[PDB]
Amino acid sequence: VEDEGCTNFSYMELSAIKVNGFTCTGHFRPTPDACRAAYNWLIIISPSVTDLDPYDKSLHSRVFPGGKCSGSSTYCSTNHDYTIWMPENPRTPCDIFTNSRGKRASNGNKTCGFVDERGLYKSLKGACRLKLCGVLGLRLMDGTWVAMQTTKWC
């Protein structure tokens, strides 16, 4: 359950956010510059929606080779040659935060790590300060962002 002899709340805690987009296809391979202008008309275009992980800022979808990408920062290539994916808008929403409650601390001036409302001990060992939607909170080594009392940079 716990680690390291730590035994004794309200915090802000945070990947289902969609990023609308499309795909360009021609049997030729690449027009990044005119694909956008083809979209600004509001080669062929079809809607393809992806999700971005708020920490890696990485778009995820089956159309992507390994299911990941990043946005150069202009185009993104898929499984095939002729297909490049491009966003309708070249960012994490700031309306995906919440207020959880797990009480955590071992000594008076020492905090080891918290426990979710499910019961799981996340340790505060080896975490780093991370800015996320403009508010400064720690990124844990397990990979979840929390806004705690806080001394390293991710």
Epitope: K57, R91, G134, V135
Partner: antibody
Framework: VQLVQSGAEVKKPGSSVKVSCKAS????????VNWVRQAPGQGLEWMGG????????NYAQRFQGRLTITADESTSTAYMELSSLRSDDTAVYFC????????????????????WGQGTLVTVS | QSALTQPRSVSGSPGQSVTISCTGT?????????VSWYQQHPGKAPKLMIY???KRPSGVPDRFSGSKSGNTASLTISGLQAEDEADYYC????????????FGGGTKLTVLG
């Protein structure tokens, strides 16, 4: 939104102040309360802010451990408590709101200070 | 800390146009930027003029206009009126590693005549 602060205060090298700010009308869910200060004849400086919905407070690197912003939704009152006052802490301390949008487009401490308080002059020595 | 670089003062006669520059605006790795300008009359609180780059709140005339270019930002007052004599501060989002916002030095606009 309408903002009014507590009155002026004269203090002492080594004492502590507490300034207040009560908010009247807020149709906004995503919002934030900040405190910027203004040394006499000098510019503005962001000191720290709070997200009252979650109680999360952010602070500048300076003013570390000397300052704590606490807000209360019930009375819509916010507070800055600065302790261990030096003489160069003589300034006017404004409280400013960030009435952010509920569609999550804008970050939490980007500096969209539309409602401002009248100010609180804190003198030391 | 640091601050945004502004001029110390600009001048204009009534009906003329002036532009206050601002350098060192911050931008996230992924491009989040947020510049804002405030107007402060002597002894009064700051008052918002431009909240996003080139965006105005209600009650601020179209005389006031913002612009962004890289880490630079410019505020333009057109048809300068006497009531525009005040201090002017740009304000930028500090970015990844500095908490909050960073203010500019402040620019004094004096209206002649």
């Amino acid at each position: 939104v309408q903002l009014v602060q507590s009155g002026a205060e004269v203090k002492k090298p080594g004492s502590s102040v507490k300034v207040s700010c009560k908010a009247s009308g807020g149709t906004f869910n995503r919002y934030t309360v900040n405190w910027v200060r203004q040394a006499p004849g000098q510019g503005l400086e962001w000191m720290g802010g709070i997200i009252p919905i979650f109680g999360t407070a952010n602070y500048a690197q300076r003013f570390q451990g000397r300052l704590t912003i606490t807000a209360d939704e019930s009375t819509s009152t916010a507070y800055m408590e600065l302790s261990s006052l030096r003489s160069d802490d003589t300034a006017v301390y404004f409280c400013a709101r960030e009435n952010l949008d509920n569609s999550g487009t804008y970050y939490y401490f980007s500096g969209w200070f539309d409602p401002w308080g009248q100010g609180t002059l804190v003198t030391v020595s | 800390q640091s601050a945004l670089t502004q001029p110390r003062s600009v001048s204009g006669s009534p009906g003329q146009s002036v532009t206050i520059s601002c350098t060192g605006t911050s931008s996230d790795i992924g491009g989040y930027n947020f510049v804002s300008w405030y107007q402060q009359h002597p002894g009064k609180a700051p008052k918002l003029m431009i909240y996003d780059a080139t965006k105005r709140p209600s009650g601020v005339p179209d005389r006031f206009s913002g612009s962004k270019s890289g880490n630079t930002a410019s505020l333009t007052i057109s048809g300068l009126q006497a009531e525009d004599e005040a201090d002017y501060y740009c304000c930028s989002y500090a970015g990844d590693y500095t908490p909050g916002v960073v203010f500019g030095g402040g620019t004094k606009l004096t209206v002649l005549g």
